[PDB]
Amino acid sequence: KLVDFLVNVQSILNAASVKCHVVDESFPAKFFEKNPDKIYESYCKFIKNRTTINKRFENGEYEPIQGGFYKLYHDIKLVCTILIHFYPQGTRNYQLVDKFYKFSSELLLRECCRIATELDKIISYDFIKISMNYTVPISQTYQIRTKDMDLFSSIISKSNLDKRPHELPNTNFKINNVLPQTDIENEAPRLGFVGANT
Amino acid sequence: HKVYICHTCGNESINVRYHNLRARDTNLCSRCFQEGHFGANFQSSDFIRLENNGNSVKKNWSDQEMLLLLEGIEMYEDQWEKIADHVGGHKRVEDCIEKFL
Amino acid sequence: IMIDAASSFVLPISITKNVDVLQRTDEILWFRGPSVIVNERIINSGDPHLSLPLNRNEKESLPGPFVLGLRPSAKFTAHRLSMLR
């Protein structure tokens, strides 16, 4: 079960890396094995102080245990943080690493599991709350106060592992956070509504 | 080849449009449809992914060509010049009536 | 109710020095309203966290948003990448 589970992950990450070549990047040992929140600060320590991800499977660095897929998680996150800081934020390979990181993390998060408010004082008094919660990373836009137009911008495609300071092409820009809307969907109207007889 | 200028901006759709199904004469890029810049009236269910490239050898009649033929007869009810370019312009007048009957 | 509003505006000052990430005209598109962030497109219409059957106060911190998105297994994707070539 876990033997194919190393092979099926490996067969995807080689074939899903032809346009971006993250897996064939020059990657040293980089033995941190720390908190994944520390995975760049220990690497920033590694830059100040001083075997690739394809060759990690080939050297058998990854065992059929959680730690063998934790190092598989640790070494992948090290390469993408190298490649995000290498490229500027507008190049195609910056977002190609950003697209490959989001896919490979989504591939590793699953399949290892297979193997104070007056409104709340009324509703919890009135209802029974079966609950479900989760985390989501939001994006940002710009905010411009022009002459009563109150302009907005598009979504900046800066990755979540960029960690660069807030530069501004204009200081009269304001910056706003776009909260993502997620719930049960409002019921779409029927097919007679969309495509009626005109 | 036609050009398909994206609605609610001035960009050009490269090879794929998001044809509105209630405005029925507007197209969108993927980016203008991803972030919901088509105005608060439309509900993102009245947007069929349509393509802008030239199709294969003729008398094939893909469902994009079939629906865009079916939109025009609901639009115009005549003027098979105005139906044939609505299919994409790569189909003759003599073939759309031969397809419709 | 009109359809032909502009909703896309361009400031005349060419500030295209640090702007390679945003949406350009080819100048910067400045829309009338903000963006829409959607988590997932395909919903899982089964999955009794959402279906709510009428049989039998509990919380459940599910792992991420990817439970409700219909993803396939890597075993078949390896079975399909072997079906690739």
């Binding site: 411009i144 106060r145 022009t146 002459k147 137009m149 302009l151 204009n170 009269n172 | 080849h1 036609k2 050009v3 398909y4 200028i5 994206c6 609605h7 609610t8 901006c9 001035g10 004469d25 507007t26 197209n27 370019d85 609505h86 312009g89 | 032909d4 502009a6 896309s8 505006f9 361009v10 400031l11 005349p12 000052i13 005209t25 598109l29 400045w30």
Partner: peptide, 29 residues
């Protein structure tokens, strides 16, 4: 910067739908 009324980009719906991309049809000299 708040006296910087921007340029509206008009779509002109007929240009959005079906504009194609005359001496090259040689019947007019």
């Amino acid at each position: 910067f708040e006296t910087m009324v921007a340029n509206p980009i008009k779509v002109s719906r007929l240009q959005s739908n079906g504009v194609l991309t005359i001496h090259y049809s040689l019947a007019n000299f």
